[PDB]
RNA sequence: CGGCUCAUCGCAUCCUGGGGCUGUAGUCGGUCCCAAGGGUUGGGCUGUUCGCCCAUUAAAGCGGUACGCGAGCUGGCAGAACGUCGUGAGACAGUUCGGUCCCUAUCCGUCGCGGGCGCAGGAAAUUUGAGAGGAGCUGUCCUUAGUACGAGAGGACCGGGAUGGACGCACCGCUGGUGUACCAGUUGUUCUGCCAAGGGCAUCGCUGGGUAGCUAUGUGCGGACGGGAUAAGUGCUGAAAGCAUCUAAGCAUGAAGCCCCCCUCAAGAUGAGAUUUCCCAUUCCGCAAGGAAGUAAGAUCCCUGAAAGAUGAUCAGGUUGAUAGGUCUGAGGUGGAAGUGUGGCGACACAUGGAGCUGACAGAUACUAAUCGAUCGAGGACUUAAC
């Protein structure tokens, strides 16, 4: 696994907020290396969504930050998983995302990509 | 894993208490002695009325290692309190009788007089 | 340490040889385009293997 | 290691009993000093239960005349004759390392029989 | 048991054993006979020399002096604090050495050596009226007309009676030696003296048990009621060198 | 002087009719198939081209495609020879397995070492440390190159370089057990090579 | 200055090998040649070389290279105390403490790793081995054997057989260490509305463990068998020299030296090796000499990875696919989840249940990601022989 350029306490918080930002907007522009590591933790989030246990909720609750997720429903990031994300991915086993890569930006040299839910 | 300048304890009734190593007899240059090696020794604390006295320099045999005495046969032995027997010249100790157990690693060499006085051999 | 000499007008021109960077990979787009870096979605059309994204 | 585990069961011994990591069992060790086998029965408490298939292992601590004796008897070895349990003891964990220190009256709290 | 600090120094210094007229030897007043030096006994021949037994603070001293005097050597006891016995050593440098005083106004240069920590560094400042240097440890310095404050000690190293005056190094050479032996002199010669310093009623036989009887009165414990041996080694040598037990002898 | 060569898998223990908890290696290779006979009068000396772990046509190549039709075997990988084998029982197309080795026979291994990456002077050349305290910052550095009057460096003085990726011979090893059905050789001791890498198992050169 | 790293080097040898002569009955010895291949210590106490002590060992070899090595390390002049000298200012190969010597490597050397180009066509593999490097130590013990020996005691030689140390090479299955996204226990506050259960931070909060990988103190293994030529010699044959001779002719013999045998790198060994197998002998411009332009065989760009790795490269792989991740089924690890129920005044216990959880470890599985494409890359010159 990639150290992602930050320290460990930063590293665990580096990605949890991405997962909130993932399942809300469904489609993120991101630095591809951070994107390349992220797909192997949020599929563990989605498959943990596909249990439906209350015990399945709390393990996500230790991970997913309680952002207000979808407007005018007050659907939480937790409450968007098991009511909408699980039923959107009932049949497909594995491979819930992909990394279509993009070019580099102007003032970094950093290669880019796009993470969606598919 | 005894070394030079290692604190050892008495296991026989020699009256001695604390033993500081000087040099490992086994081989030449090496300072690591596991079990049964001959270890020349000095004495930091002793009971007075006995065979030897305080600060005497004698020879001795390791009995107890905290490090792993390991057989070829897969078995393992490690003691807690690193003790040592106070021998004189040959493989016969200068002690009267042994405080506590000695491992069964003295079979390889001819130390089969201290094994006779053992309360336990494991 | 110190550069003891000026380096030459030769060897400086003889140092930059393996410095000049390679051509990046260029592939012809499969829909409306002219050039696009291999394996990655072009920014012109925004399509990849028959998929608008 | 799927192409290894097949050879292992053929040499494996099943005649063991299963046991918790923190307990007291007795073991019989076949010893070959000369020509006579001094089959001895070593009993006491156990600490380690580090696995290994072929190399499943455990440790036996036994106080002896004022000092404990760590025993690293191999689970998969014919020199073991028989393992016989004594105390199904309540132990919080699978690593009783700290009773290399509290050697005295701390063997009771860790040996709540069950 | 000592480096090129006393033996090596004396070796090169021994080269000035012809310009020296009177030699001043030094032995301990507590123990006379072991406090000689058999290396300097071989370099110092055919010279009048006077023996001195300093820190005299008497019955055993005088007795030994009588035998020593008849031995061929003159013994004069001096002091380090008071001015007593210095009125017989000053006039002896021009009387005993009358062979080199009126034979030719030549100087009287003296060589002062012997055993360390027994009264060698304090032999210059009271023969003069000014301090020069001083150490309370085993070592000293490395320096009438006098340039003499070195040390003889022992080139190669009976020692049980030696270190009770602390004439050698004791950082770590041996500390249990003075413990196991020195109380026997308090047992064998003056058994009544121990009954008051720590308040013991009767001296027991186990010399290790008398440590714990002393040490629990002391309080230099180590862990959980256990009295430390090595600290109780210190409180015995701390008292015998300050003469807390009084005036005691060694050899008879 | 015989030899198979095959991949390794892991490390195990096997005790056989004694307490001997012997560390054993996981050397499992398929029946080697003589590729091409080197004869002395044609190619300077005698040898046996051997193959192992044959792949499929995805990694095949018209050079290596005709390399095997003389032997009539699928295109495999790791094609090595054996300078020491007999030139009698090793014809073109012959198949050799583990049925050659049995119990109590000295073996030899030459295998590719682990690549530890670009280490320092310490773990490559066995260089010890300097003093870590007492004012000296100096440690973990290979010391002076040597004298002054040469005004140069002796080629052979140690220095931190990349260590690994070269072969290692280990002689005087023994076999504890053979199993022909899983095609497994078991070697007492330890054998150089990371997992899934080829191991020449040649007869222990007495 | 002395050490620390590290070395290499001489022989005038410290031990181990090979013989000589003595005061070597046998064991054990001093002393003189051969010999530089390895190997040659750890403490107190010393500024520390000087010296002293202890324990060692097969023995702690002398010496050189800016008294080997400070752009690699290691302070290890002003103020004072002093004594002494000079009236004093101030002196001193006089004594004690306090006391800051800088560097990003350009070049050459080194240790690696690449890229170009060569090797009269490309490729793909396999190798040859001139030449270079590494390896070269021994101690105890057991037989033979108390045999050979000697008034005795003593007690081998030659030669087998165990077992160590040092040192080198490999490796994680044992044995332990490590593990910063694993596991639970717990403090302090804050945080999701509260309770419960959780998150954040506090050296990774702290303490108890630990997969993987990397590791030594752990484990395996090495220094064998030997041949060939030589030293000192040991000799045989005999000349010079009617005897005779180690020597001149001519033979042997004989050392851990030295070649070679083990190992490793080695055809950029410009002498560019050699087999095996591919691959075609195009289209074209120029009278021709030739020059291009497409392409094979094939490699690569590019992409997912690690057995690899500072990057390059190497290696596994690129949709007739298991390279990676996910998914499962597992392993190993910690080990008794939550919820609920019971019991307890409660703190908590017990039940459902070796539970729940898990980072690189397995094994299946096209579910995602390796698309779609592009580029490079040969038509084999010239003598002469044999065919
Ligand atoms: N009471 C008493 N004390 C004395 C006597 N002599 C010396 N001392 C004290 O014991 C200490 C040691 O004396 P010293 O002369 O420095 O010993 P040293 O033998 O000269 N040492 P070094 O040979 O190394 O210079 C001094 O400090 C002094 O005060 C004495 O005769 N009587």
PDB file of N, CA and C in Angstrom, chain D residues 24 45 87-91 99 102-113:
ATOM      1  N   UNK D  24      -3.782 -25.704  32.226  1.00  0.00           N
ATOM      2  CA  UNK D  24      -2.783 -26.660  32.678  1.00  0.00           C
ATOM      3  C   UNK D  24      -3.104 -28.014  32.078  1.00  0.00           C
ATOM      4  N   UNK D  45       1.159 -25.453  33.445  1.00  0.00           N
ATOM      5  CA  UNK D  45       0.355 -24.500  32.687  1.00  0.00           C
ATOM      6  C   UNK D  45       0.968 -24.230  31.317  1.00  0.00           C
ATOM      7  N   UNK D  87      -6.972 -28.235  33.824  1.00  0.00           N
ATOM      8  CA  UNK D  87      -7.773 -27.092  34.248  1.00  0.00           C
ATOM      9  C   UNK D  87      -8.231 -26.293  33.043  1.00  0.00           C
ATOM     10  N   UNK D  88      -9.508 -26.381  32.721  1.00  0.00           N
ATOM     11  CA  UNK D  88     -10.083 -25.470  31.742  1.00  0.00           C
ATOM     12  C   UNK D  88     -10.217 -24.107  32.405  1.00  0.00           C
ATOM     13  N   UNK D  89      -9.220 -23.252  32.208  1.00  0.00           N
ATOM     14  CA  UNK D  89      -9.092 -22.027  32.974  1.00  0.00           C
ATOM     15  C   UNK D  89      -9.503 -20.794  32.190  1.00  0.00           C
ATOM     16  N   UNK D  90     -10.208 -19.896  32.868  1.00  0.00           N
ATOM     17  CA  UNK D  90     -10.538 -18.601  32.289  1.00  0.00           C
ATOM     18  C   UNK D  90      -9.271 -17.780  32.178  1.00  0.00           C
ATOM     19  N   UNK D  91      -8.853 -17.518  30.951  1.00  0.00           N
ATOM     20  CA  UNK D  91      -7.753 -16.617  30.657  1.00  0.00           C
ATOM     21  C   UNK D  91      -8.249 -15.609  29.646  1.00  0.00           C
ATOM     22  N   UNK D  99       2.889 -14.093  33.274  1.00  0.00           N
ATOM     23  CA  UNK D  99       3.153 -14.980  34.389  1.00  0.00           C
ATOM     24  C   UNK D  99       4.546 -15.581  34.343  1.00  0.00           C
ATOM     25  N   UNK D 102       4.710 -12.653  37.813  1.00  0.00           N
ATOM     26  CA  UNK D 102       3.842 -12.868  38.963  1.00  0.00           C
ATOM     27  C   UNK D 102       3.779 -14.348  39.328  1.00  0.00           C
ATOM     28  N   UNK D 103       4.947 -14.967  39.465  1.00  0.00           N
ATOM     29  CA  UNK D 103       5.029 -16.381  39.811  1.00  0.00           C
ATOM     30  C   UNK D 103       4.881 -16.590  41.314  1.00  0.00           C
ATOM     31  N   UNK D 104       3.659 -16.875  41.751  1.00  0.00           N
ATOM     32  CA  UNK D 104       3.386 -17.097  43.158  1.00  0.00           C
ATOM     33  C   UNK D 104       1.940 -17.468  43.424  1.00  0.00           C
ATOM     34  N   UNK D 105       1.090 -16.455  43.556  1.00  0.00           N
ATOM     35  CA  UNK D 105      -0.328 -16.676  43.817  1.00  0.00           C
ATOM     36  C   UNK D 105      -1.199 -16.086  42.712  1.00  0.00           C
ATOM     37  N   UNK D 106      -0.616 -15.917  41.530  1.00  0.00           N
ATOM     38  CA  UNK D 106      -1.339 -15.363  40.392  1.00  0.00           C
ATOM     39  C   UNK D 106      -1.809 -16.466  39.450  1.00  0.00           C
ATOM     40  N   UNK D 107      -1.570 -17.713  39.842  1.00  0.00           N
ATOM     41  CA  UNK D 107      -1.968 -18.860  39.034  1.00  0.00           C
ATOM     42  C   UNK D 107      -3.407 -19.272  39.330  1.00  0.00           C
ATOM     43  N   UNK D 108      -3.968 -18.719  40.401  1.00  0.00           N
ATOM     44  CA  UNK D 108      -5.337 -19.028  40.794  1.00  0.00           C
ATOM     45  C   UNK D 108      -6.337 -18.158  40.039  1.00  0.00           C
ATOM     46  N   UNK D 109      -6.052 -16.862  39.970  1.00  0.00           N
ATOM     47  CA  UNK D 109      -6.924 -15.922  39.276  1.00  0.00           C
ATOM     48  C   UNK D 109      -7.042 -16.280  37.798  1.00  0.00           C
ATOM     49  N   UNK D 110      -5.949 -16.778  37.229  1.00  0.00           N
ATOM     50  CA  UNK D 110      -5.923 -17.164  35.828  1.00  0.00           C
ATOM     51  C   UNK D 110      -6.405 -18.587  35.600  1.00  0.00           C
ATOM     52  N   UNK D 111      -6.689 -19.332  36.660  1.00  0.00           N
ATOM     53  CA  UNK D 111      -7.160 -20.703  36.549  1.00  0.00           C
ATOM     54  C   UNK D 111      -8.530 -20.879  37.188  1.00  0.00           C
ATOM     55  N   UNK D 112      -9.445 -19.961  36.891  1.00  0.00           N
ATOM     56  CA  UNK D 112     -10.845 -20.169  37.223  1.00  0.00           C
ATOM     57  C   UNK D 112     -11.344 -21.355  36.410  1.00  0.00           C
ATOM     58  N   UNK D 113     -11.623 -22.460  37.092  1.00  0.00           N
ATOM     59  CA  UNK D 113     -11.953 -23.699  36.412  1.00  0.00           C
ATOM     60  C   UNK D 113     -13.320 -23.601  35.750  1.00  0.00           C
TER      61      UNK D 113
END
